[PDB]
Every structure is written in C-alpha cells, then in structure tokens.
RNA sequence: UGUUCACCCACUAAUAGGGAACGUGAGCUGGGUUUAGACCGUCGUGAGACAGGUUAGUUUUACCCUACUGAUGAUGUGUUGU
RNA sequence: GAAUGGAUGAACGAGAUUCCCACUGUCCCUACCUACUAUCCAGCGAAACCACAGCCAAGGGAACGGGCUUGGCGGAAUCAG
RNA sequence: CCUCUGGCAUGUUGGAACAAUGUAGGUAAGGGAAGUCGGCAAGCCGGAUCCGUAACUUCGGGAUAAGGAUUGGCUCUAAGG
RNA sequence: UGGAGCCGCCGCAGGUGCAGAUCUUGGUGGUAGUAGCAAAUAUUCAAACGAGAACUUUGAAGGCCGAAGUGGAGAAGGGUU
C-alpha cells in the first residue's frame, strides 16, 4: 500500500539502486509492517525481497 | 565502475584538495587526500641548481 | 502571499518599435 | 434556515440543501433546470445517464461556445454537454433528500422535485501568472443548492 | 487605385451556394419538353456508379488526324438494374406554378419501396399502405380510384411515374430503395395515362428508356471532401513563404468603403457534396446482365465482335470499393460526378443533339477488364493462369 | 529601378484608361522615405543641418458585435415520413 | 584629393553589391504524408475591451452615419472559420 | 547514435476523431531563380585514401583552391616486436 | 424588517446636496464556461489500501536521460524545507 520507505531502506541496506530491490507483491503486509532496517534485514535473511540481477550487456 | 565523491567540503580542484585513489577492505574505492610534496633545501651559495643530499625532503 | 505589484510599464510603443507608426 | 418558494403542504414535502459546494455555477444551474420537474427515480436515472454520457443536459442560457450533440433533440435544443461533477453532487443531494423523506415518513417512489434553486457562493480566489510579469485572478465560482421534493402522484 | 494586372475570376458565381446537398439522390430539375407526335416513353432512369475502365474503339470522323485510328477512352460503368413502377402522379399548370394534383400508388408495393417511408425499419411495425392496399379488391374502392384516374385524365397536363430501384440484385450494403418521379413525355394525356396504368406494377429495363450512342445528361451529388480551405476550394493563388499568419489564405478581401465581404469573395468552407448536372455524355454500350439458359452467360458483357473472348466488365477482383456487377449496365464516355456506390440519374437531353460529335456512331473493339486494384497486367483468370503456369497452390 | 512613372525584348485578337480613406500592414513584405549606430561630399569656429548618396536597423492583439463562407436549427402545416 | 591622409594591395570578414556552374516548390502550380495544436468531451478556468449597443443605399450634418430623414427591409438560440 | 550502473514518468491534465488555417519536419514528374528589393528560406557538396590544383601575392599563403577515381562483405598474402 | 435613540419651530455655525474629472476606495457583470491547461518521443496490464484509482504503492512489459546525464556529492543562497 505504501512501500517507498521500505524500498528506500532496502536500497540503502543492499547498497543497490531500488531499481534492483524486488519487494514481494504477494506478501505486501509482511514488508509494510517492517518500518525499519534490522526488520527489512530480517526480510533479507528470510528471502522475501531479492536483489534483482544486472541487466545483461553482452560482449560476444 | 564506482563514481565516488569527496569526504570534505572543499569542492574545487585547489592545491589543498589533491586526492589519490585507494582500495579499501570494504571492496570499494575511496579518495585519500595527499600531502603536499615538499622539496629538499637549497644551498646558501646560490650557484648550484641541485638540492642537498642526506636531508629528508 | 504578498500583494502583487502593479503591471510594469512596458516601453512598447515609441521610436524604437516599427510595429505601428503614425505619419511622420 | 429559509428557502425561496416555501411549500404549500409541508407534511408531504421534504427539503434538502447544500452550501459552499465547489462546483461550477453554470453547469449546476443547467443540470438543475434539466432535473427540475421530474420524478425522483427518473431524475436519478437521468443523472446516471449524464454520468455515463447516455443522456445529456441542454445548455439553454449559458451556451457560449458550447458544442452541439445529437442527444439534445430529446429536449428540443442544439447545444448539449454532460456535467459529471454537477450530476454527481446533485445526485448525492437527491440521496440526502430521499433520506430526509424516509426520516419524515414519506412515500419514496411518489416524490417529484417541486422547487430547485442554484445560487452563487463566495468565490475562491487563486492566481495565474501571465505574460510580462502580470498576475490575474483565477476564481472558483461555487454554488449554493437548495431543493424541495413533494408527494405528487 | 485600380488593379495593376487584370486577371479572370477564381471560381464561378453561378455555383456559389456551396452548401452540403439537402438531397442525396440526384434530382431532375428539368425534364425534356413533350409534343403529341412521338410515342410515350420514360425520359430518365436511375443507376448506381460502379467503376471506371478503358474503351478501345474505332474513330470514324473525317478531316481529323485521328481519322480511321484507335483511341482509348475513360468510361463510367453504371450498374442499372430494371426499376419497378409502383405509382403515378399528375400535375396541373397553375399561375403560381406546376402543382401536383393526385398521386396513385400501386396495390402490391415491395418491401424495398416500403423501407423508404421509414427512418427505422427495425423498430417499425411495417404498417405502411395497409389501409390503402384494401382499396383495390372491393367495388367502391376501385370505383373511387377509377374516378380519380378519370379526374387525372381530364385535368392533369403533366404526368410523372413513380419508379423505385431494386436493391435485391445489387452488391451494396443498403436495402432502402430509391424512389423517383420520371416524367412520361409522349402523346396525349389519355394515352399517356393509359400507358402508365399498363406499366403499373411492372418492370422497366434500360433499353426501354435509353438506346445506343445517345448523348444524355448526368445528375448526381459530388463526392464529399469536407471543410476545405480557400486554396483547395476556389483554386486561388497561394501567398508566398514569407507570410506570417498563413500562406493558404486569401490576402485581401476587398476595399474599405463598401467592399465588405460579398458572395463574390472567395472563402474557406464546404468543398464537395454538391448537386451537379453535367450534359452531353455519350452512351457507348447498354450492357446485358447475367442470364441463364443452361448455365451462366458471362460472355455478353464485355465480349465485342473484335475481341470474341469470354470476359465480363467485372475486373479481376471485382470493382474497387463497389462490388461485382451482375445486372445490366450502361457505359458512358468520360467521368461522371460522384464516388463509388453513388446513386446517379441518367436524363434524356434537353437540347436537339444535331452535331457530328454528338451523332457519331460507336463501334467497340476492346474492353479493358484488367485488375483495377493496383497495376493490373492480365485481362482474365484463364489468361493469367495460362501465362503464369502451375503455382504452389495447386 | 524600392519605385508610382519610364524604356526595352518577345508573345498576342488586344496588350485601353481609371475608382473604391491616393482600395487592400489585427492580409503579407519592409525595398526606400522617416528614430537611435556609422562613412563620404557641401555649409557652419562649433554642437550640428542637408526631398545629397550609401549601410545595418523587433511590423503587436480578434476569443467580442456586424458582414460573409460553411453547420445545427427556429416559427406555422395536429405529429412524422416520402 | 594627399596623416581633416591619397593610391595600390596578399590573407582575412555572421560587412555591402554584380555575374556564372551545379542545385533545389522561390516560382510555373500546386499536391500529399507525419507529430503537436486547433474541433468535441471529464475537470479547472482568466484577460484586453465595454455611452447604449450593433443589417445597408442616398441626402444633409462638424463637409466618409449603427442611430436623424426617405427608401431597401428586418424572424428565436448558436457552432467552426 | 545505442546499451550497463544510477534516475524518471514525458515535465500546471487525460479521452474520442484526424476539418480548415497554423507550428516543426519531409517528399514532388518537366523547367531550373523565369518568384522576390535581394538565391530570403530551402536545396547541392561534405569523412577518408590516391592523383591534381590557376590567377595573384607581403613568397608565409591562396588551398580542403577548382576538377576526377575509390569506399560493402568474405577469403587470403606480404611487411611492421 | 429592525432593535434604541429621534424630530418640528425660532436663531447660530459648517468639512452641507455629485453623473462625469483616462476621479480615489470597495464590490460585481457582458466577454465567458470563452482564450487556454500543445517546448524536451510513452505509456500499458494485474493486485494492495479506500467510500472513491489514469496520476499512491507493488509486480511485469515497453521506453527515455546515455557517465560534458533526467546519476552520485559540495560552494553561494534557502532555514527545517
Ligand atoms: Mg642526513
Ligand atoms: Mg501563464
Ligand atoms: Mg519575471
Ligand atoms: Mg484594369
Ligand atoms: Mg515575417
Ligand atoms: Mg487503380
Ligand atoms: Mg491608401
Ligand atoms: Mg486593414
Ligand atoms: Mg501590421
Ligand atoms: Mg528599410
Ligand atoms: Mg539613422
Ligand atoms: Mg475556439
Ligand atoms: Mg579638401
Ligand atoms: Mg577629405
Ligand atoms: Mg458609429
Ligand atoms: Mg536522444
Ligand atoms: Mg509528449
Ligand atoms: Mg502524464
Ligand atoms: Mg516542471
Ligand atoms: Mg520538381
Ligand atoms: Mg527577377
Ligand atoms: Mg542561405
Ligand atoms: Mg579562391
Ligand atoms: Mg464639522
Ligand atoms: Mg458616484
Ligand atoms: Mg475550449
Ligand atoms: Mg508547458
Ligand atoms: Mg542526492
Ligand atoms: Zn653549491
């Protein structure tokens, strides 16, 4: 419902974009109740949000 | 390729703002501010262009 | 917000403007 | 409060009004003249048709630059438009008037809108910046609406 | 001051109520004059514009450089099915004009003619002429109608006939038939009305109205083009590139003291969808439709005495944006007004056509029935298959 | 040629003369008159002047009423359609 | 008309003129396509201007009238130009 | 010009059609400036390699003067530590 | 309608009567539901929240800025944004 705070916190913890933060669309409330990191870090170690891989740029 | 910033507030390319790149154990590159290169002393004769030896520059 | 000031004086018609001139 | 054209039989007549309603006065007056005189269920069906763009509202007095439509030949006019915010707000006001008739103990499906009046409200001032450093007014013109239903069947 | 360089007027002052046509069907404004010496006949017919093709024919006028040569001609195919007569109407000459007196419809009116009387055939209950058709099988009703025929025979001076097209035998989408008054010009009023009574509830083909190599008139509404500018509309001169407000406009309307904008000043507005009557179009051939004695007879449309092929005037893939002509047709030299699928009135000539160019006979030699849906290069299916050979789809 | 005028080449049946706020800049252009910058010639001690010559010099607004071009329409025909 | 400088003059010039080669819608002579507008609609929504307001011919007038006089005549509400 | 890291929702709104006149791009048979105060705008040429390059001149230039030929892919050869 | 002061006569006095002054202040109309919300290519589908979703969020797809950026940080300035 409102996950800009959680996406910004996940970007700050994962040290990535928030282009690569994949907040789980099925379990929305289980991320929305995590108002901070060390709760979003618990979501990381549970694996509910995943670092998206880099968009490929080939060289062959 | 990590485009990194300063760690101070002087945002100009002044002689007091010379940096060098350094790799850290955190696996990221950072600026370290270089000390200014001092020079060896010159003789009191005034006729030799070279600088003295044995003195730390 | 403050009261808006009066519309400036646009030096629009005069010797400089060729958009409309009278007989001279 | 007082209304204009007080009803002859207040036992079988209900009342409903609304003040400082941020609508457009001209669209509200035209849809009020379109809704005036109908039955309440036909009036709600007409306002739902205005919302769904099935039946229109003819603009008879405030018709400056108003495009023509085919649906205004039901009324016998050329201009016609579909004021959605006006239709929704004086659909909520008919809902309030039906609730007031239910509170008074009136028959619901025998109500005819006897009187409706749309007045102007105090304008809501804002600004717009135009050329050569000038600021002009940008004024919302809201409306006061008041209406009376009467058991006429 | 005056105009420096004199120039003719852009546009015609006769054609300038340039409004959209209030009528869709081409209306006859002037029928030919009648004299009681020639037999009775129709003076107009109503057909639909099908398409365009070539005609290679033999030129037979002396004195020209093109004497005894072969030219191509742009022609119009107009599919003209035989119409149905469903009524008559009489006219009397008044000092205020030419007033209708009595209209007598037929007993059995077809549903295509009944569609014209309704704006919505679906929601209608099809109740037209239900108390009028009962005025035929009774004694008093037929007596009153015969008294009306006798009153028309006594008092009417101009007799027109009510005929409608047949939409069953046409490839068009619509089914609402077009009705039309056609003035019967011929002998006396009594013989005229007796012949119209005989031709009531009957079929009128094309050969009973028009014949070979006749100079006729074309009446129809222009292909509509919409709200066009004055450059596309009146063909005025374009302003140069350096203009600020526009270069496809009229620069000066007129003077100060009154030359405020008149009917003669060109403006931007409706181009197309105008009623037009154009005279002196030559009929090259009145064709014959698809008739069956054992199977289909496709040969009699486009096969001449020099071609001797088995072709019809339908192109390869049919006519573009029209359909396929299965009925008898006419073929007019030139181009007629209107787009495809357009209703079109063929009228007999108002002027005594006594010219060599008007009375020159026409002998066809080659009717080009190639594919008009692009750059066609074959005349018929069997010629195309005999040239191409076996394809993959065989 | 900015030209109004003018003269010349060619075609043509003929290349007649004019008006409408010296028709027509909320139609265009700005060519030369007629701002402010400059150069030359004459006059003036000078600032400056010169229907003397040259050069570069912002061409504003219609959505209002009428007129016109197009389009819905309107009054009577009881209502509609042909 | 001669340092209120005269004459010549290579290179240079978003300086001012004339001709030629190629080139092109500048034109003969215009046509078509695309994107954004303009059109209609949901919402929001001003400003200049305004004696009253607005159909013309002639006459006279303060010497070019929407109004006065004599004629022509005039028919609701509007939309895009 | 396209893509990766990073960033965003197309810049004070959207929906339906594709009228005129516009704004910005283009394309036009034949002629090539006959248009216009005036080649204004638009259009031609354009990179690189190999030739070749006039008058004049301050001998430095003009000069990329002017004017020609070639240019893709694949498979090789020879040379350059 | 209103809720708390007011008038006639004899005399005195004045900051004593508005239709204009491109009058001063305040308010409101026609224009007008009109001009306009058109500079920098672009959005679409499903779900969550809610009375309410084209603009919020999440997922997916297609795009743009293209490392002299529509990225990451400072100075002047703003002062809690
Ligand atoms: Mg030492
Ligand atoms: Mg603005
Ligand atoms: Mg400013
Ligand atoms: Mg003349
Ligand atoms: Mg210009
Ligand atoms: Mg074709
Ligand atoms: Mg003049
Ligand atoms: Mg003018
Ligand atoms: Mg002007
Ligand atoms: Mg000039
Ligand atoms: Mg000057
Ligand atoms: Mg408009
Ligand atoms: Mg001298
Ligand atoms: Mg001198
Ligand atoms: Mg006046
Ligand atoms: Mg780009
Ligand atoms: Mg855009
Ligand atoms: Mg948007
Ligand atoms: Mg912005
Ligand atoms: Mg060309
Ligand atoms: Mg010339
Ligand atoms: Mg140029
Ligand atoms: Mg040279
Ligand atoms: Mg006082
Ligand atoms: Mg006053
Ligand atoms: Mg609008
Ligand atoms: Mg903008
Ligand atoms: Mg930042
Ligand atoms: Zn020394």
PDB file of C-alpha atoms (C1' of nucleotides) in Angstrom, chain B residues 1 3-5 9 11-12, chain I residues 67 69 71-75:
ATOM      1  CA  UNK B   1      32.931   1.479 -12.039  1.00  0.00           C
ATOM      2  CA  UNK B   3      31.840   7.227  -9.398  1.00  0.00           C
ATOM      3  CA  UNK B   4      32.732   8.441  -5.910  1.00  0.00           C
ATOM      4  CA  UNK B   5      32.553  11.806  -4.163  1.00  0.00           C
ATOM      5  CA  UNK B   9      33.505  20.238   1.808  1.00  0.00           C
ATOM      6  CA  UNK B  11      34.599  21.042  -3.789  1.00  0.00           C
ATOM      7  CA  UNK B  12      37.244  22.668  -6.009  1.00  0.00           C
TER       8      UNK B  12
ATOM      9  C1'   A I  67      28.963   8.552 -17.371  1.00  0.00           C
ATOM     10  C1'   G I  69      23.374  12.598 -17.709  1.00  0.00           C
ATOM     11  C1'   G I  71      23.388   9.931 -11.892  1.00  0.00           C
ATOM     12  C1'   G I  72      26.333  10.444  -7.036  1.00  0.00           C
ATOM     13  C1'   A I  73      28.281  14.841  -3.749  1.00  0.00           C
ATOM     14  C1'   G I  74      29.754  20.180  -2.432  1.00  0.00           C
ATOM     15  C1'   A I  75      30.111  26.379  -2.547  1.00  0.00           C
TER      16        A I  75
END
